[PDB]
Amino acid sequence: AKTLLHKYSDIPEGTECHRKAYASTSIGGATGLIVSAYSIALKPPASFLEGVARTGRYTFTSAAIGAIFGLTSCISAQVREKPDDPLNYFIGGCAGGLTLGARTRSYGIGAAACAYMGLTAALVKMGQLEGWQVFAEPKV
Amino acid sequence: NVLQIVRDHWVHILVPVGFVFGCYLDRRSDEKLTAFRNKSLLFKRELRPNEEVTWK
Amino acid sequence: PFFDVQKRLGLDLDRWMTIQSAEQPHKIPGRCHAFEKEWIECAHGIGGIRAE
Amino acid sequence: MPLVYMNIIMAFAIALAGLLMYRSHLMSSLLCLEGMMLSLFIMSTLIILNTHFTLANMMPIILLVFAACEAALGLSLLVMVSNTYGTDYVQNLNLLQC
Amino acid sequence: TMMSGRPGRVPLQFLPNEARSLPPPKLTDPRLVYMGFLGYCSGLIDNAIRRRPVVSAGLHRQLLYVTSFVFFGYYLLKRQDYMYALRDHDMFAYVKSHPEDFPEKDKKTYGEILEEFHPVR
Amino acid sequence: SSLLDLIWLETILPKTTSFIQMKMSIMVSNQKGLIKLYFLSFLITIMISMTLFN
Amino acid sequence: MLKIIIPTTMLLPMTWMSKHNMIWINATVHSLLISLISLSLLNQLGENSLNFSLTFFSDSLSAPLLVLTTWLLPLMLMASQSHLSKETTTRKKLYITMLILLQLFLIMTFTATELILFYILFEATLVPTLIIITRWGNQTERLNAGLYFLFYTLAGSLPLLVALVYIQNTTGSLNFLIIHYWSHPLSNSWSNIFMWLACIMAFMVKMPLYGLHLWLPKAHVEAPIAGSMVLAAVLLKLGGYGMMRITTILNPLTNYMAYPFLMLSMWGMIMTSSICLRQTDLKSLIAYSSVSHMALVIVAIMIQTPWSFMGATALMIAHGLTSSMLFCLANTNYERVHSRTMILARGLQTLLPLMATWWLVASLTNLALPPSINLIGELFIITASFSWSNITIILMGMNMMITALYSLYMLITTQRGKYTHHINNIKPSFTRENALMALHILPLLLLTLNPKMILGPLY
Amino acid sequence: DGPEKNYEKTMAILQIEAEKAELRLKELEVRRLMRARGDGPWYQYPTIDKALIDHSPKTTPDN
Amino acid sequence: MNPIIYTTLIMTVMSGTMLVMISSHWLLIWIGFEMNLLAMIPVLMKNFNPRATEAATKYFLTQATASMMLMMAIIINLLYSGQWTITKMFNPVAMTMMTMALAMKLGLSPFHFWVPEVTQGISLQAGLLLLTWQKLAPLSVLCQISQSINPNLMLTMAMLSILIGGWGGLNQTQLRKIMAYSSIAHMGWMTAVLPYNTTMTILNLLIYITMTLAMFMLLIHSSATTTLSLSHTWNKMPVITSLMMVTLLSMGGLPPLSGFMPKWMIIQEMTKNESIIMPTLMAMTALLNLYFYMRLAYSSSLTMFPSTNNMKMKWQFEHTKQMKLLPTMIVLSTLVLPMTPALSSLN
Numbered sequence A: 001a002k003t004l005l006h007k008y009s010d011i012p013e014g015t016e017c018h019r020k021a022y023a024s025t026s027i028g029g030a031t032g033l034i035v036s037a038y039s040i041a042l043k044p045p046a047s048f049l050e051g052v053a054r055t056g057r058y059t060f061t062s063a064a065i066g067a068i069f070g071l072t073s074c075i076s077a078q079v080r081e082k083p084d085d086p087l088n089y090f091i092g093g094c095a096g097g098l099t100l101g102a103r104t105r106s107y108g109i110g111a112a113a114c115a116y117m118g119l120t121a122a123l124v125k126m127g128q129l130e131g132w133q134v135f136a137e138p139k140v
Numbered sequence B: 001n002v003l004q005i006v007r008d009h010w011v012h013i014l015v016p017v018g019f020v021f022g023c024y025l026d027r028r029s030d031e032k033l034t035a036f037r038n039k040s041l042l043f044k045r046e047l048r049p050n051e052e053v054t055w056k
Numbered sequence C: 001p002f003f004d005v006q007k008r009l010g011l012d013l014d015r016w017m018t019i020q021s022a023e024q025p026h027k028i029p030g031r032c033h034a035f036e037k038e039w040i041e042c043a044h045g046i047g048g049i050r051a052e
Numbered sequence D: 001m002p003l004v005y006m007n008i009i010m011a012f013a014i015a016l017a018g019l020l021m022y023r024s025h026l027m028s029s030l031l032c033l034e035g036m037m038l039s040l041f042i043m044s045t046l047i048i049l050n051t052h053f054t055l056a057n058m059m060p061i062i063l064l065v066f067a068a069c070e071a072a073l074g075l076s077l078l079v080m081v082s083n084t085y086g087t088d089y090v091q092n093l094n095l096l097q098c
Numbered sequence E: 001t002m003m004s005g006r007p008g009r010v011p012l013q014f015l016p017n018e019a020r021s022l023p024p025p026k027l028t029d030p031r032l033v034y035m036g037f038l039g040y041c042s043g044l045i046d047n048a049i050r051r052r053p054v055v056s057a058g059l060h061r062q063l064l065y066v067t068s069f070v071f072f073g074y075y076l077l078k079r080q081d082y083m084y085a086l087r088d089h090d091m092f093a094y095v096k097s098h099p100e101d102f103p104e105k106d107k108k109t110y111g112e113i114l115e116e117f118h119p120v121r
Numbered sequence F: 001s002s003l004l005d006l007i008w009l010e011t012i013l014p015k016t017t018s019f020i021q022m023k024m025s026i027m028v029s030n031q032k033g034l035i036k037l038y039f040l041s042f043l044i045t046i047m048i049s050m051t052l053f054n
Numbered sequence G: 001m002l003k004i005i006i007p008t009t010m011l012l013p014m015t016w017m018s019k020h021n022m023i024w025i026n027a028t029v030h031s032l033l034i035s036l037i038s039l040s041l042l043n044q045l046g047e048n049s050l051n052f053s054l055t056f057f058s059d060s061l062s063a064p065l066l067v068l069t070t071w072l073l074p075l076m077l078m079a080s081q082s083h084l085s086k087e088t089t090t091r092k093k094l095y096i097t098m099l100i101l102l103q104l105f106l107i108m109t110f111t112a113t114e115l116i117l118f119y120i121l122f123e124a125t126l127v128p129t130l131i132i133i134t135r136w137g138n139q140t141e142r143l144n145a146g147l148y149f150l151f152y153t154l155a156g157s158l159p160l161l162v163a164l165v166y167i168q169n170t171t172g173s174l175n176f177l178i179i180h181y182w183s184h185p186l187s188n189s190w191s192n193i194f195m196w197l198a199c200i201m202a203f204m205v206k207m208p209l210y211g212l213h214l215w216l217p218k219a220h221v222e223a224p225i226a227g228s229m230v231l232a233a234v235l236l237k238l239g240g241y242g243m244m245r246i247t248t249i250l251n252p253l254t255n256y257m258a259y260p261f262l263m264l265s266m267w268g269m270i271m272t273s274s275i276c277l278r279q280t281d282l283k284s285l286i287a288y289s290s291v292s293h294m295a296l297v298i299v300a301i302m303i304q305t306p307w308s309f310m311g312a313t314a315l316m317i318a319h320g321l322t323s324s325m326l327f328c329l330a331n332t333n334y335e336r337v338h339s340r341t342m343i344l345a346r347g348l349q350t351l352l353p354l355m356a357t358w359w360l361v362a363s364l365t366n367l368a369l370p371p372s373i374n375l376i377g378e379l380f381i382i383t384a385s386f387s388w389s390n391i392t393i394i395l396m397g398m399n400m401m402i403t404a405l406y407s408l409y410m411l412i413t414t415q416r417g418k419y420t421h422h423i424n425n426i427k428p429s430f431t432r433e434n435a436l437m438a439l440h441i442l443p444l445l446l447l448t449l450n451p452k453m454i455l456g457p458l459y
Numbered sequence H: 001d002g003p004e005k006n007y008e009k010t011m012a013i014l015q016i017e018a019e020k021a022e023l024r025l026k027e028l029e030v031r032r033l034m035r036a037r038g039d040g041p042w043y044q045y046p047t048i049d050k051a052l053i054d055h056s057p058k059t060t061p062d063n
Numbered sequence I: 001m002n003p004i005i006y007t008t009l010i011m012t013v014m015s016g017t018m019l020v021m022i023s024s025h026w027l028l029i030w031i032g033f034e035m036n037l038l039a040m041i042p043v044l045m046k047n048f049n050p051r052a053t054e055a056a057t058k059y060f061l062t063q064a065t066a067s068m069m070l071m072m073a074i075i076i077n078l079l080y081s082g083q084w085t086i087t088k089m090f091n092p093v094a095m096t097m098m099t100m101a102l103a104m105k106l107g108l109s110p111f112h113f114w115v116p117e118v119t120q121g122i123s124l125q126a127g128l129l130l131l132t133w134q135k136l137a138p139l140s141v142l143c144q145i146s147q148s149i150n151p152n153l154m155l156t157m158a159m160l161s162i163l164i165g166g167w168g169g170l171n172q173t174q175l176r177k178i179m180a181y182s183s184i185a186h187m188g189w190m191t192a193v194l195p196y197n198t199t200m201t202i203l204n205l206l207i208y209i210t211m212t213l214a215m216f217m218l219l220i221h222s223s224a225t226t227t228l229s230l231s232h233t234w235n236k237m238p239v240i241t242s243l244m245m246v247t248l249l250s251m252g253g254l255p256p257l258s259g260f261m262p263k264w265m266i267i268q269e270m271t272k273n274e275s276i277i278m279p280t281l282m283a284m285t286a287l288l289n290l291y292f293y294m295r296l297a298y299s300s301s302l303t304m305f306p307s308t309n310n311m312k313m314k315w316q317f318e319h320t321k322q323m324k325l326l327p328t329m330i331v332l333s334t335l336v337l338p339m340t341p342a343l344s345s346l347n
């Protein structure tokens, strides 16, 4: 539910790198499990063993991406000594994209994932700073 | 030949008629923005003895 | 959406079954007749937000 | 909220899961639908009788009637499927695809 | 805005009685002329689809299209004007009834207001 | 002319978009038409909305 | 303004009820008559504007563009009269209808006192152009060109709608007068940065900016002649006009948000000028020249100084006329040759001397020769950019030299040299083409006498 | 025509647009307050009518 | 079937929808849904064939599951508050389940899978009725309880619906599947503005109904089901292809055509509630709908595909049956932008 997001957000950005990495790993694992369940439901490959292999690889890939993103972003935030800077989230997103490319083993997916994940992470950080709303409440 | 060229050249009068109609519409639309006629703080003028409006 | 034909015509097609306290046969009372009556009278003609 | 209502909602959820699992035998799908309907009838009857909402005693019967009608309709469709294929396996309905 | 639950509303009235207190749209209204133009376009398209002389196939049919469109446009314009008048009336009544939420702004002059100047170089 | 205008500027904005949308269309529209998988996905999304959005 | 909009509308029933062999005559005559009516708008005053009504207003920025738009249509008809000979009456009438609709949309766009109406017509100008490109196009790549032209524009302009409605929600009005009078500074924030990007990108994509210009060579090459002239002359100026109208609310953010676009334009002018040198096609060469000139206009607008704006307006008008002339000449060559390749037909000056004269005059005007308004706008922008920074002169001078080089290369390859031996269908030039070139060029040499009419509101 | 015509037309147009902008801001604020509180004619979601209640002896004193 | 029986079934479908819209009791609304489903099935099976039977059984299964979920939600709402009137839901679980039930009935993703197949199996006339008329009851019910719906669930389902419709429309070749995905995307657009302003929902519904009625009537007029069968049309009735291309451009959201009115207006409303990211995303997504509409227009009218010899014989015969209201539908779906403020009529 929203408990994992609260766990990730409660930690200060510039401290507790291991806890941030654990929270990001949990979020990535949950997303990987959900996408694996959808893939299994819509495309039953051949049997139980292939299905469990596919769900395991998807969950591991997503968890690795999340862990790398969290660790890199927190490390950059601490080292630069400048929190609330979207540049740290951009570096984290590009690192996550790089691990996605390494897991898929093709340079094109790695570069595209770096670009389009650093951009998304930077946008998320900017929204958190400025209070951008995705699901806006019905004011008027 | 009268009443014969009309059936072939009646289309030429369309554009000038449209122009005249547009001029009339412009004047009529200008008639709706007279809320400050002769009340501007710069062009405030006393009317002539035989003048009713500053501009039309 | 909701075309209130009933209130326009005063037909009462389906309004008798809406609540517990509305003209039960043989005047058999609901188990929570008093509470429902109190809440309905509290929230009548007040609007959804203010009633809540 | 006592345990009886919890058990009835659990039965409805189990029947819904059985309907959505879809092993084979579309007749089993219809059976799952009607199990869901029976759970609905039991729950509504208990709720209405508990609160002495007299005028609402009509609601279950009406419900049942309509639902049974749907069941009949469903059965008809099933029959036609078999008459086109010789059997009612769910996997045979794959002519139309996204 | 959601004026659906506005008190004292007849459930299925196109034009309430109070809507008669507003000036009706002129018969030469530009919007009514636009509805007439839409009717004429519908007539031309109808002639085109049926494979008939587009300009001069059915004069009665084109006239009926124009008249129906003008009729519906007139009534729709009346309803639109009434609804907008209702919205403005509710706005003004609410702003009058709640002076605390709409305080009078302390009118100020540009002479005693400091706006930062950003030179262009 | 060739390397920037005809190769990389084409690869970045239009060609990448075309490739991504083609791949997504192929992924989404490839359904065998089995209602077994459809209703399994329906159950999955019912569970997800029940436990996530509350 | 309705004295202009109404006759343009009446052009449609006039065309559709004309005889089968007299549509061109009527359309040309009444289009020219309309242009004369549009001439009255040019007499602007040093004060605010000619506020006609609540919906339309005219400035000294809108007046030259409006006059050029009204003047272009007769030339488009004379250009299209050639390749539509074997076309049915209904399709020719549909073509003229598309041209008239395009002119009407542009006329309503250029005044558009409210920004949402401006955006609505600014996107409405996209349908007739796409229909013209994809329907009456020769090559098989017209479909891809139409798709590129549609999507490049729409992707950029879609966030603009959101930005505009947001501005209306906060500011409370989108009328340009109120927007100008009540303007307030934009604070340096991420939200304001993205508002700036949304409001700017929609106009920068259409100009086009270097890096987003991929749609322009395709659209210009695959389109028919009339589509080519309307793209190069007027449709490119929509972005610049919108940018000069909308930069009134983006200060002082622009002071540092202009760096990426300034660098992109100041390098893309050099890149496209160099590209023009090594080109196997004429229309592609002219399209890249248009890209270079529009990049210079982008630099001028982003500098945001009075001389920048004056030079931008002058360059807009001059480039429109020059590019239209060049596309006309290329089309006349292609009609006889049927190949559209620069080196396939050579030495045409020996066979067609007057067309060689027209080629020389068009190349000289494109070369920014004094005292033509091309060089007036060029020099104003050069001085303004020099005031902005002393190092821009290097890039601008390099662009000038390369521009001269590729202009004279275009002239020499097609006009000088020995004629190609195996071409024997170079018929003498008709009176229509000579009249078209004369009507293209004479307004330029006439406007060089009264520059103040095209120098914009900051004159 | 003379400059006074354009001058006064512009003044009238400016007044109209300024009034419209102020009215739009007021409308947005009024809508926000009305939806937040619910004490105005707008955003009045229906409730149960109280004319449906039966006020009669119910065969049981305690209702 | 017999014309009298067909008319009776159509009257019963309309009566069920009317009963859903004009009733203030949850049980009566459920009864109206059941009547609609019961009478709608033979309309799909008017032209008997295996494809029609399979489509009808898929539709029946989906609708029956949705109705059972709706009844369970009604039961829970009654349990936690002894109220039958359709008003604030008074319970989160009941609201969630009723939202899923109405999503299943409407066709919003991820419950969208049945729409393309049901539209493909059944005929054009059946498809036209299913695509436009069916939406009126669930949309009315959703509008009646919009103050209780959770914005997160509705907004995410609408976004997913827009994405799925846009992506799935690119691949399809048959016109009926293209229409199904177009309907999915339009409903994703329309249900996103439910929490904010239901008037925009009704306006978008009316505009979409007009556009899809015009397009389906044009497809029936020129009896084409696949893309190539439509490409052959220009050789006989070019006017139909031109009108269809104009309507397709309108359906893509291109101004100044009528199809731009809803999207624009909808965006405006979500900008009043400080929702900026989502309208931008839905616009860039509707670009995909525009793309496949443009591809269809390229195939149909803007280019002349090769014809067939036998088509010569079709030149001599005229369309015997003319469907009334087609010109009106085209005009209303193409040239009604200047009358946008009439949406204040609370249509």
Ligand SMILES: CCCCCCCCCCCCCCCCC[C@@H](O)O[C@H](CO[C@H](O)CCCCCCCCCCCCCCC)COP(=O)(O)OCC[N+](C)(C)C
Binding pocket: B023, G003, G036, G037, G038, G039, G040, G041, H001
């Ligand atoms: C020796 C002389 C040398 C100089 C000659 C100069 C001649 C100039 C002719 C060209 C004029 C250009 C067109 C100007 C149009 C803009 C002005 C126009 O819109 O005004 C309209 C009026 O236009 C004229 O009535 C009609 C002029 C149209 C014809 C111009 C002359 C040339 C026409 C040639 C047409 C073809 C000739 C025949 C060919 C076979 C409406 O005026 P209105 O808004 O109410 O004025 C309000 C202010 N009032 C009350 C003081 C008047």
Ligand SMILES: CCCCCCCCCCCCCCCCC[C@@H](O)O[C@H](CO[C@H](O)CCCCCCCCCCCCCCC)COP(=O)(O)OCC[N+](C)(C)C
Binding pocket: A085, A086, A087, A090, A119, A122, G188, G189, G190, G193, G210, G211, G212, G260, G261
């Ligand atoms: C490709 C063809 C051309 C397309 C269009 C090109 C133009 C788009 C480029 C965007 C213009 C600039 C964007 C942001 C400018 C702000 C300045 C910022 O970048 O500099 C530093 C910002 O630091 C980092 O840059 C943070 C952002 C990092 C993430 C952004 C992505 C960077 C690379 C992505 C390139 C992709 C571009 C094309 C996308 C498709 C200064 O740090 P700081 O003083 O503290 O913050 C200043 C802002 N404040 C004052 C409001 C707080």
Ligand SMILES: CCCCCCCCCCCCCCCCC[C@@H](O)O[C@H](CO[C@H](O)CCCCCCCCCCCCCCC)COP(=O)(O)OCC[N+](C)(C)C
Binding pocket: C001, C002, C003, C004, E004, E010, E011, E012, E013, E014, E076, I203, I206, I207, I210, I332, I333, I336, I339, I340, I341, I342, I343, I345, I346, I347
């Ligand atoms: C293309 C745009 C859609 C066109 C739709 C077809 C047009 C022809 C329809 C013929 C008339 C329609 C209705 C017939 C009049 C009598 C019915 C009347 O009593 O209904 C009233 C209501 O009248 C209708 O709602 C207005 C119909 C007008 C529709 C046109 C608006 C389209 C706006 C944008 C396009 C501009 C028009 C283009 C030319 C038509 C009662 O309202 P009320 O019961 O109290 O509120 C119910 C709604 N709630 C529940 C949400 C509160």
Ligand SMILES: CCCCCCCC/C=C\CCCCCCCC(=O)O[C@H](COC(=O)CCCCCCC/C=C/CCCCCCCC)COP(=O)(O)OCCN
Binding pocket: A123, A130, A131, A132, A133, G152, G155, G156, G159, G162, G163, G166, G191, G192, G194, G195, G196, G197, G198, G201, G205, G212, I274, I275, I276, I277, I280
């Ligand atoms: C030829 C292809 C060109 C593609 C152009 C696309 C990029 C255009 C630039 C971004 C477009 C989206 C901007 C949003 C529209 C402006 C609205 C606005 O300004 O409101 C902001 C909202 O700002 C945003 O929401 C921006 C979110 C952006 C999400 C979409 C990202 C799209 C891609 C981003 C990177 C692209 C930038 C470079 C593009 C270069 C061209 C490829 C204020 O937020 P408030 O709620 O009022 O907060 C006040 C209280 N603190």
